Design a binder for this molecule. Structure first.
Ligand SMILES: CCOc1cccc2c1OCC(=O)N[C@H]1CC[C@H](CC1)CC(=O)N[C@@H](c1ccccc1)C(=O)N[C@H](Cc1ccccc1)C(=O)N[C@H](C(=O)NC)Cc1ccc(cc1)NC2
Ligand SMILES: OC[C@H]1O[C@H](O[C@H]2[C@H](O)[C@@H](O)[C@@H](O)O[C@@H]2CO)[C@H](O)[C@@H](O)[C@@H]1O
Length: 518
């Protein structure tokens, strides 16, 4: 619909210091008359791209940087353009976290990493290895306690162990991440996940443990250890637990490697308050007194602002956060991440419960994460074939056989669709406002309403791609060939994330090829 002009609405996760952030809003209001309203809706990272796609939602959205690439792919975020003087106040690697396609798409706030939190009056000398946690639990269970409890429902918490001995999402390569090479099902990951499942099999942990259960158990003193981030420290300070924060245990001699998030603030593209949003973020929040105000509600961890981080670095809890972050890896921000997470979430839940074995669970995850790449391979060269004088090399034997037969199929069925629905395609394109690269993103938004609503079948999918080819022809026509590849990425993103389960159910492009058997 429409975002309200002349005020700021902010969405931040319910575990962060939202009250502290609203106090920064009060100072902003005092100085300007502009009211700032902080909201903490459930599933805001899932809701944001739904409401933002219809030109609605908050002015500012807070989340870890990994989600932001997807938002930017669908044109939901304003480009941010701070001057050099302001960029110098934050650590360069935080700015890297929020750079997508050579554009800054958010303001970095804080560096979040998981640590091992332990009760000093149950266990003054915590274990340096995962391997020694079973023996600790055996001893503590005879005392009516347990060794370790943490959220097994979110793969963010289990990933440090899965990655320890070689598991990886998409291989880092000199700042860049190659989607061609995914490592969710390599030996390192199997070993890590197997060890977790053994803990559950031998009753050292419970597969149904979640954030709420773990937090309560630790804060009541029922378990000697938990895994959590700086935001959690606040509720422990309130409890009667003398706790420490330290490096995560090693696995097979190898450090636990958490995926490190940079909590970031992005500006809704549909906002009529962009200049106010930037003024708030640069000049009220990202100051010593601004972050102090948020930090005092719930610890942010290590902060992106150099001046204030220097003060925090003295706290031993922050030293531990940083030790864990340096041993981990900063997450990619690419649009694939969402699918990857959802895929790994399913794998751990199934392996832990018994529903699948570890090998079967990681295999399905490997597929669910790969799909984005193969999809893009096919859609890219279909659109390019259709729109331009490029050589049609797929039949000449350029890419894999699945891509080859998918393209052949698509040439037959897709061209049929374009022949028969010429006027309908003209009508939809004319209703769209496509003359540039920004507007190609506006397709990303619109179509999910047209595409996602209702059932899913290959027919509807061919229609989406076929319409994409029709739009690519238009782009070529108005000297905009450079948008065809971004257009293909939009379609591919919109499709894979929206129909991930179904696509995996159908066995991806092999299914498509089968369905029509051209
Ligand atoms: C005008 C731009 O249209 C779209 C652009 C991007 C995404 C979409 C667009 O379609 C909206 C629409 O109503 N566009 C109109 C203008 C384009 C037109 C569809 C209608 C294109 C078309 O013929 N699509 C047909 C089709 C596709 C491939 C081969 C033969 C037929 C289609 O999607 N039919 C399927 C049934 C089907 C057909 C063949 C194999 C498997 C399943 C369907 O589900 N059909 C649905 C149904 O309720 N009963 C048959 C209707 C439907 C079809 C496709 C979609 C949505 C609804 N795709 C989403
Ligand atoms: O579990 C997958 C989940 O991991 C990360 O979410 C973290 C977030 O970064 C933290 O700030 C905190 O809120 O805990 C979350 C896990 O419950 C990713 O950022 C997220 O995209 C992903 O779904």
């Amino acid at each position: 619909g429409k975002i309200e002009e002349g005020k700021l609405v902010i969405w931040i996760n319910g575990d962060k210091g939202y009250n502290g952030l609203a106090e920064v809003g009060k100072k902003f209001e005092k100085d300007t008359g502009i009211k700032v309203t902080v909201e903490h809706p459930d599933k805001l990272e899932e809701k944001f791209p739904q409401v933002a796609a219809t030109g609605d939602g908050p002015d500012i959205i807070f989340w870890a940087h990994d989600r932001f690439g997807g938002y930017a792919q669908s044109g939901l975020l304003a480009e941010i353009t701070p001057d050099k003087a302001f960029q110098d106040k934050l650590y360069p690697f935080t700015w890297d976290a929020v750079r997508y396609n050579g554009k800054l798409i958010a303001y970095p706030i804080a560096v979040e990493a998981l640590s091992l939190i332990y009760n000093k009056d149950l266990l003054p000398n915590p274990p340096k290895t995962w391997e020694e946690i079973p023996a600790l639990d055996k001893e503590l269970k005879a005392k009516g306690k347990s060794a370790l409890m943490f959220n097994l429902q979110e793969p963010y918490f289990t990933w440090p162990l899965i990655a320890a001995d070689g598991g990886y999402a998409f291989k880092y390569e000199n700042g860049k991440y190659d989607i061609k090479d995914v490592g969710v099902d390599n030996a390192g990951a199997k070993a890590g996940l197997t060890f977790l499942v053994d803990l559950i099999k031998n009753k050292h942990m419970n597969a149904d443990t979640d954030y709420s259960i773990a937090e309560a158990a630790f804060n009541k003193g029922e378990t000697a250890m938990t895994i959590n981030g700086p935001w959690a420290w606040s509720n422990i300070d309130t409890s009667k637990v003398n706790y420490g924060v330290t490096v995560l245990p090693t696995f097979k001699g190898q450090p636990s490697k958490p995926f490190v998030g940079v909590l970031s603030a992005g500006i809704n593209a549909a906002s009529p308050n962009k200049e106010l949003a930037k003024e708030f973020l640069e000049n009220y929040l990202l100051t010593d007194e601004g972050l102090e105000a948020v930090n005092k509600d719930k610890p942010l961890g290590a902060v992106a602002l150099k001046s204030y981080e220097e003060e925090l670095a003295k706290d031993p809890r922050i030293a531990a956060t940083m030790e864990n972050a340096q041993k981990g890896e900063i997450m990619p921000n690419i649009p694939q991440m969402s699918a990857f997470w959802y895929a790994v979430r399913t794998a751990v839940i199934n392996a832990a419960s018994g529903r699948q074995t570890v090998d079967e669970a990681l295999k399905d995850a490997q597929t669910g994460s790969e799909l984005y790449r193969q999809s893009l391979e096919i859609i890219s060269r279909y659109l390019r074939e259709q729109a331009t004088g490029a050589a049609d090399t797929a039949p000449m034997g350029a890419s894999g056989a699945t891509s080859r037969k998918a393209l052949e199929t698509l040439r037959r069925v897709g061209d049929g669709v374009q022949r028969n629905h010429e006027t309908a395609f003209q009508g939809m394109l004319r209703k769209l406002d496509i003359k540039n690269e920004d507007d190609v993103k506006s397709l990303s938004r619109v179509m999910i309403h047209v595409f996602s609503d209702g059932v899913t079948n290959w027919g509807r999918i061919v229609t989406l791609i076929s319409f994409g080819a029709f739009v690519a022809k238009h782009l070529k026509t108005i000297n905009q060939e450079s948008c065809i590849e971004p257009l293909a990425e939009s379609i591919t993103d919109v499709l894979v994330r929206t129909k991930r389960d179904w696509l995996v159910k159908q066995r991806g492009w092999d299914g498509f090829v089968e369905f029509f058997h051209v």
